[PDB]
Design a protein around this ligand. Sequence first.
Ligand SMILES: C[C@H](O)c1nccn1Cc1cc(-c2ccc(C#C[C@@H]3[C@H]4CN(CCCC(=O)O)C[C@@H]34)cc2)on1
Ligand SMILES: [Zn+2]
Length: 295
Amino acid sequence: MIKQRTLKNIIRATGVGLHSGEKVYLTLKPAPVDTGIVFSRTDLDPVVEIPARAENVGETTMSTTLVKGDVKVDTVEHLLSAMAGLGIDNAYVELSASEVPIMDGSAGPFVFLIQSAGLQEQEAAKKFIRIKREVSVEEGDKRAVFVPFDGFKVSFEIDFDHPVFQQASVDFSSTSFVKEVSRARTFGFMRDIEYLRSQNLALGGSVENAIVVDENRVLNEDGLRYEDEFVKHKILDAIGDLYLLGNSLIGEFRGFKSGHALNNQLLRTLIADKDAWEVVTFEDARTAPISYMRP
Ligand SMILES: C[C@H](O)c1nccn1Cc1cc(-c2ccc(C#C[C@@H]3[C@H]4CN(CCCC(=O)O)C[C@@H]34)cc2)on1
Ligand SMILES: [Zn+2]
């Protein structure tokens, strides 16, 4: 059977908020069966806990933000992506400030820390959300779609009018999340980055945690990790946003110029349309359409 997973040991990391520029201490802890991923602002007294679910999504401009009243947890998507890629169902994520650390801009450092700590299978079946009808949302020239598929695959297509250039498809029957997606970094363009900074955003961004692009080229001295790094990172972002469903997907995602906002609308519409999905478990791992690496 495919079993739920938590962390075997706690993970501690420190780093900086991409947007706030604040220093943040992060802890991932084990959690019980059916907890989900829950973020906790431990700098506050009392502590404010915000389940990583679609209904708690507040701000969707330049990152995915979770909100409960006037308290926020910003930039959850890269860490969530790491957790979906490793099959982590249950975990507490404690943060000493409002924003998850950006690390090197990718999910790589989070996956390494997690896998160094190890995972723990738990004695309860892993629940999956299986797409049974096509669900599509559009706004302007952006589109995001779920399609029935016996496995898990993601496609993204961006239309950037810029010299540095994209589309990519990843099916997890052959693509390795760890080797081919997790290392793809955050990116931004100089004119936007300075707009953002002028609006008190992007305060922690630097070549240390992002691919920085001027009008023509990548300015990072050591260049790119993958030739299609930009689009691979969008796939990473989409994986994190989709994990806000609260369970892993059995289906296909296709994004066409979609960001955090549209991804969140897609999740909302799916949740609402209860004929388009059902919760399934696999009591025999041997016959399941997906598999996970050893814990
Ligand atoms: C998070 C979301 O999931 C997401 N993933 C993918 C994309 N995004 C959106 C996103 C990207 C960014 C973002 C913000 C800032 C920077 C940057 C930057 C460095 C600063 C400092 N540098 C100065 C160098 C010159 C000198 O040496 O003096 C140049 C410039 C890059 C990217 O913010 N939001
Ligand atoms: Zn991102």
